[PDB]
A paper describes a structure:
Phage satellite P4 polarity suppression protein, Psu, a building block of the viral capsid, inhibits hexameric transcription termination factor, ρ, by presently unknown mechanisms. The ρ hexamer adopts an NTPase-inactive, washer-like, open-ring conformation until NTPs (preferentially ATP) are engaged and RNA is bound at the SBS, leading to ring closure and RNA entrapment inside the ring. Our cryogenic electron microscopy structures of ρ-Psu complexes show that Psu dimers clamp two inactive, open ρ rings and promote their expansion to higher-oligomeric states. ATPase, nucleotide binding and nucleic acid binding studies revealed that Psu hinders ρ ring closure and traps nucleotides in their binding pockets on ρ.
A ρ variant harboring a P167L substitution has been observed to bind Psu more tightly than wt ρ38,43. However, in the ρ-ATP/ATPγS-Psu structures, P167 of ρ does not engage in direct contacts to Psu that could explain the higher complex stability. We, therefore, also determined cryoEM structures of ρP167L-ATPγS-Psu complexes. The results showed that ρP167L associates with Psu in a similar manner as wt ρ, with a preference for the complex II constellation. In this arrangement, a single additional ρP167L subunit can join one ring at the center of the complex (complex IIlocked). Incorporation of this additional ρP167L subunit leads to an interlocking of the two ρP167L rings, due to refolding and domain swapping of the central ρP167L subunits, most likely explaining the increased ρP167L-Psu affinity (Supplementary Discussion). Such refolding and domain-swapping in ρP167L only occurs in complex with Psu, as it is not observed in a cryoEM structure of isolated ρP167L. Parameters listed for ρP167L-ATPγS-Psu complex IIlocked refer to the ρ1-ρ6 subunits of ρ(A), which retain the standard conformation. Also in other complexes, lateral access may be restricted due to conformational restraints imposed by Psu binding. Such conformational restraints may be more severe for ρP167L, which exhibits higher Psu affinity. Furthermore, the space in the central channel of the ρP167L-ATPγS-Psu complex IIlocked is reduced due to ρP167L refolding.
Residue numbers in the entry:
A (entry chain h), B (entry chain g): 4 to 190
Write the structure that this text describes.
Amino acid sequence: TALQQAFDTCQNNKAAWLQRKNELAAAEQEYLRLLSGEGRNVSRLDELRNIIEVRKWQVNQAAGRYIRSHEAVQHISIRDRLNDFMQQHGTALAAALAPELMGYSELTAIARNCAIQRATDALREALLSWLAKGEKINYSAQDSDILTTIGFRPDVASVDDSREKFTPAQNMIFSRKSAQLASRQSV
Amino acid sequence: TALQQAFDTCQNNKAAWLQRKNELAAAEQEYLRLLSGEGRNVSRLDELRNIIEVRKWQVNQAAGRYIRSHEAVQHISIRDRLNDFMQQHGTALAAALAPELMGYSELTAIARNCAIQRATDALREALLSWLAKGEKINYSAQDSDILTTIGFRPDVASVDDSREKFTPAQNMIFSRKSAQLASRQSV
């Protein structure tokens, strides 16, 4: 059930990021409209700029969180698929890799590491050889629907909104300003 | 037929290494027998020491070549076994790795390399788990005989006879000395 909770937390993160983007766009269009207005409202313009900055930071944080959650869902799905696949074909896979994998239970640390790295890049070469053909890859039947719903890759909006990087001091100041803004808006 | 060629090359290299070892042992025994004698034979002792050094260098070269050929034949066997195993189970393996390897036919270089790396350490984790359960690994039935004859690892004598690490200068000096020794033996 870990896959299901990963999936619906990813969906919640997506919904939160969409809400953040929507409210940021609403604030931006309101600020532009007040710029077009005749009224000066200098204090209103400054506070709107502050709101725009803090909500852009919130959108960036939400996009980063959603991207991380999506990557976690993909990683756990990969882990489970390798698990049940190789429970299926472990004997054959080890037979294909016996000269580097036999005696693993008693080999020393350096020998174990070198053997697993040799098996590793042998597997990498095999994957390259298969991908050279260009066969179409379909999803696992057991977990196809969840991974199709989350998509192969996050949207370009997610990666671009998360492109901006913030220093820890910027992170704490933006968190404090966002908390203050939320408290003020609630009251 | 490449596997058979590598196997017989490894066998020939092992035979040559054994021949060099027995020649060096005979030279050492004869040198000790002369040294234990009351005769001086200073020139004889010096030329025997030269022959001993030449034989030791030849033994090192033969052991290194034999180890390299054994590694090569093991690598070829692994490549062929993993190739036909993955030709058998490619659909299932790609389905297990579907959420991460799609689009390889047209993705950019950096994305392709990162996807290959992520699939690679996912496979590493799966193989590590299998080694954790501890089921005994057997050689592939198609080429079990060759892999058993060549052994799981090269002989420890070849392992500790190839730790001299001669410098290139010493390498061609010993090559010239060995050629001169062969010419003198012909005389």
